[PDB]
Design a protein around this ligand. Structure first.
Ligand SMILES: C[C@]1(O)CC[C@H]2[C@@H]3CCC4=CC(=O)CCC4=C3C=C[C@@]21C
Length: 251
């Protein structure tokens, strides 16, 4: 009754928790972990498609465009909510991939991925640091779904731009529910938008990591599943060559 109505719909359409189905039983090797991660990733991109089909405005873009923006955000979405969920249930002090897959410091001993898990870990730190609320989270995550377009833009640019705007303004709502300044509320906005502007670069490291484990998978002994494989082949190279338009909040 103080929660703006979209922010309650955001609540409700949020997915239920996805397990990794991870054997836990026997001792992690670095291929098995990598493989669970993926299976877990598969189950999360199904959940993103479902999620997108109820989010107000997503389905009145052109099919294509809806396919392009998911293909283009799924890493950045995955990473974000590992943030979120790490921050919410383990104090940002452990990486909460899933209920059945939680990584403490021990566990990323075997590197490959030690270094990368450091970098994933930045996000739940910044959330702890910023004391990010649920409402602001719901709104910035839609923002990352709308964060990057083709260099030639979208088929439904205009609706796009409308939808982006109407969720930038939903975030100024949420920011509003607690930062009652006009000074503070501003700086907060600034801060919640640099935070997003910042996960580009962090993402381009997952990205480059995910393609080279892709490509060396057979060497590596790492199974990628089908849905995950297709978005990687489809967009990752192109993304990684910087043949996409990052939307910036700041200059
Ligand atoms: C192992 C790897 O191929 C590279 C980085 C891994 C990513 C990191 C982002 C991530 C966090 C989640 O909440 C979903 C599982 C998850 C992944 C599963 C597979 C990936 C994409």
């Amino acid at each position: 009754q103080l929660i703006p109505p979209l922010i309650n719909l955001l609540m409700s359409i949020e997915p239920d928790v996805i397990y990794a189905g991870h054997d836990n039983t026997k001792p992690d090797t670095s291929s098995s972990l990598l493989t669970s991660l993926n299976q877990l990733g598969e189950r999360q991109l199904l959940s993103v498609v479902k999620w997108s089909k109820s989010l107000p405005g997503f389905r009145n873009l052109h099919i294509d465009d809806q396919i392009t923006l998911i293909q283009y955000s799924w890493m950045s979405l995955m990473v974000f909510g590992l943030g979120w969920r790490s921050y919410k249930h383990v104090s940002g002090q452990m990486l909460y991939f899933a209920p059945d897959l939680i990584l403490n410091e021990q566990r990323m001993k075997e590197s490959s991925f030690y270094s990368l898990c450091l970098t994933m870990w930045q996000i739940p730190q910044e959330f702890v640091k910023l004391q990010v609320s649920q409402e602001e989270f719901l709104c910035m995550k839609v923002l990352l779904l709308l964060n990057t377009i083709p260099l030639e833009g979208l088929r439904s640019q205009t609706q796009f731009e409308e939808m982006r705007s109407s969720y930038i303004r939903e975030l100024i709502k949420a920011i509003g529910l607690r930062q009652k300044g006009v000074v503070s509320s501003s700086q907060r906005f600034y801060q919640l938008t640099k935070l997003l502007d910042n996960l580009h670069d962090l993402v381009k490291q997952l990205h480059l990591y995910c393609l080279n484990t892709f490509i060396q998978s057979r060497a590596l002994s790492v199974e990628f599943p089908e849905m995950m494989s297709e978005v990687i082949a489809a967009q990752l190279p192109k993304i990684l060559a910087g043949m996409v338009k990052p939307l910036l909040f700041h200059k």
